[PDB]
Amino acid sequence: SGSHYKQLIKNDENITVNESVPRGRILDRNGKVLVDNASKMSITYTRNRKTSQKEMLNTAKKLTDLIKMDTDKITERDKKDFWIQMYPSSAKKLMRKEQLMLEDGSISQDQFDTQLRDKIGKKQLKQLTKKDLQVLAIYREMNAGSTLDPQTIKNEDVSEKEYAAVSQQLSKLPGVNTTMDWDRKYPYGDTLRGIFGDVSTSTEGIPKELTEQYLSKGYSRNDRVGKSYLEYQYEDVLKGTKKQMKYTTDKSGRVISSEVLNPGSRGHDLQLTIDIDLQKKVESLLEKQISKLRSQGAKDMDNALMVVQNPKNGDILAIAGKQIDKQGKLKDYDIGNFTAQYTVGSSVKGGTLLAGYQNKAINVGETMVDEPLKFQGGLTKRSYFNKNGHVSIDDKQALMHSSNVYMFKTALKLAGDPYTSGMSLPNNIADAGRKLRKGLNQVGLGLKTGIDLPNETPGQIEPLTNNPGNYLDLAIGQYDTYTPLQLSQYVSTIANDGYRIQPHIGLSIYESTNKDETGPLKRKIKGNVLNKVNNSNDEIKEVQEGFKMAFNEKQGTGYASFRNTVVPSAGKTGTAEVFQDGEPRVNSTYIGYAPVDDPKLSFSIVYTNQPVPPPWLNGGDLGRDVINYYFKDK
Numbered sequence: 001s002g003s004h005y006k007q008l009i010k011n012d013e014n015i016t017v018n019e020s021v022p023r024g025r026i027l028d029r030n031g032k033v034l035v036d037n038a039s040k041m042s043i044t045y046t047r048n049r050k051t052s053q054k055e056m057l058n059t060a061k062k063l064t065d066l067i068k069m070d071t072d073k074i075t076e077r078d079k080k081d082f083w084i085q086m087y088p089s090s091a092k093k094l095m096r097k098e099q100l101m102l103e104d105g106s107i108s109q110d111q112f113d114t115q116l117r118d119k120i121g122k123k124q125l126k127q128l129t130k131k132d133l134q135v136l137a138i139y140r141e142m143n144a145g146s147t148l149d150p151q152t153i154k155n156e157d158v159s160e161k162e163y164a165a166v167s168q169q170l171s172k173l174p175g176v177n178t179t180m181d182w183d184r185k186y187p188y189g190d191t192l193r194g195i196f197g198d199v200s201t202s203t204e205g206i207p208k209e210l211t212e213q214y215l216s217k218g219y220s221r222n223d224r225v226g227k228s229y230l231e232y233q234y235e236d237v238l239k240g241t242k243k244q245m246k247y248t249t250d251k252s253g254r255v256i257s258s259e260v261l262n263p264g265s266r267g268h269d270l271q272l273t274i275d276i277d278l279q280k281k282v283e284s285l286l287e288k289q290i291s292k293l294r295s296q297g298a299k300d301m302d303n304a305l306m307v308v309q310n311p312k313n314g315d316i317l318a319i320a321g322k323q324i325d326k327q328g329k330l331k332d333y334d335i336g337n338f339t340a341q342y343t344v345g346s347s348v349k350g351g352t353l354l355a356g357y358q359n360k361a362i363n364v365g366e367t368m369v370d371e372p373l374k375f376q377g378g379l380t381k382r383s384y385f386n387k388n389g390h391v392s393i394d395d396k397q398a399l400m401h402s403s404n405v406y407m408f409k410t411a412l413k414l415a416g417d418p419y420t421s422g423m424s425l426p427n428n429i430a431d432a433g434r435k436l437r438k439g440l441n442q443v444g445l446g447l448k449t450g451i452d453l454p455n456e457t458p459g460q461i462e463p464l465t466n467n468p469g470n471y472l473d474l475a476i477g478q479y480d481t482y483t484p485l486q487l488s489q490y491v492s493t494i495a496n497d498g499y500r501i502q503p504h505i506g507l508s509i510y511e512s513t514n515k516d517e518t519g520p521l522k523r524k525i526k527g528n529v530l531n532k533v534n535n536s537n538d539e540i541k542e543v544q545e546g547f548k549m550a551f552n553e554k555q556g557t558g559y560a561s562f563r564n565t566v567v568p569s570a571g572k573t574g575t576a577e578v579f580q581d582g583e584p585r586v587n588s589t590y591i592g593y594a595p596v597d598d599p600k601l602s603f604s605i606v607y608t609n610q611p612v613p614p615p616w617l618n619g620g621d622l623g624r625d626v627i628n629y630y631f632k633d634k
């Protein structure tokens, strides 16, 4: 045996060869196998413009002893016709008169036949035992096209008993070859299928696009390769090494001997950071919660993603994501966490603060008045929690309350232009934008996170020249948009004291050569440190405290979902207003980590297009439930 063959180099009467191994497996972080190779055998016939009538049914009669066949493809016509083949007996006795007419030459053959494959279907068709549809189901498949088109006879479900029996008699069977190939096998089901990706099927060879890049390394378009995501991304490890000989030709045939240069070897096995038992439970809770939220009003809500990370080193432990339709039909959408972007809202604020501290615009514990701002001509902004009054508050109480206006004042102070009632808005915020977007970037927001998959988007980044109103919105998460992974990289950076680490999913690579044994560690796949935030540890602890307050103080936004986590949790929410077909909606985001005192888990969650609240759905619960399940025993 097995190795659907590749190539034959040819110099001056000298030959070289190359054959195909199977791909690395793919394992969870405790070794549980996620992606295996299974064997698919398959019997082929090869017909001739020079073997018609009977030597068909002669091969087919022999084969209907080594294999059993699926007759779900036979047709009344083929039955009809095969009847004539098989009963020259009763057939000759059906066309007694027509025989003569054909013979005297007053009906053609055509007509004779059509009149015959019309004469029977009742009594004498039910003269076909199971034996014969068996030999027919092979015969049928033994011609569809002429020439040497190697038509498959049995494809699905070819038992090792069957493949052996018939490779064993290939001699007695003229026309019949047998192959075996390797096809991926997914023990855990749909789970993470979209992230694993896909391999072309050699019928495909390499597909039209990925070419060049595949050929500028050295492949056949016969070759099966990695068509997407993990398979695409660790192609050069999950692929084997190839079997390779060199030959000595002479005379008009002679080959004196070969020397084995490269014996072969299966792909290196790849271990993921996933914990599949966590992964599965997350998918579970997600759905319980989508169904819970739909039955409280959220019938238009249409996405729901969740990343879970270990913030001390970037490990992605789970990654989940459904699309929802208007009646609840889930589709898997795990790639959604880093290929889609959303407006996230009030949950970037801890990064905005960290941009103010860096630039002297504010400093730790600076208090300010939350009140309706009034701008020239009559524009007003306000914090939801305080639509009408006036309230002085810290930064860390700004995070707890999710005060938009503490963040607008910070934003203006950063733009050289502190708030004064009546004021007009700086007509040129270019350099404040640059400073503030550079601060957010430092915690992951706005950049690609570095993840080891393709198609990571850094989010929609529209410009900042003279749109002050936007510049402000950007300080409360309502201009630039972000992937749920960025949210998860940012909350993790807060959680590990200002280190922004590359998320990864690939964890370790293994030298596998024997089958099913793992074999030695080859390479680790580190979550690299991208950058440290430009901030004092007193600045970082202010934010951390604000996050802890937002989850554990009676007036925190995340009180009713995170206060009774089995271990203390910290985080932050956002509720961005959005529109869908002109109706009013909210995205709704969560981020957090636990335990507060030495975090081992960090997460982001996104729901999109929930209803606008009077009734505050509590989609954080999904987050509380994951922290509770993760930490069930400490």
Ligand SMILES: *C(=O)[C@@H](NC(=O)/C(=N\OC)c1csc(N)n1)[C@@H]1N=C(C(=O)O)C(=C)CS1
Pocket: 344, 345, 346, 347, 383, 384, 385, 401, 402, 404, 476, 477, 478, 557, 573, 574, 575, 576, 577, 586, 613
């Ligand atoms: C942050 O997003 C901020 N604003 C909103 O939530 C808005 N509408 O809420 C119904 C909104 C969108 S654009 C704008 N000027 N206001 C705060 N977010 C939270 C939170 O979830 O912490 C609140 C609870 C409401 S106010």
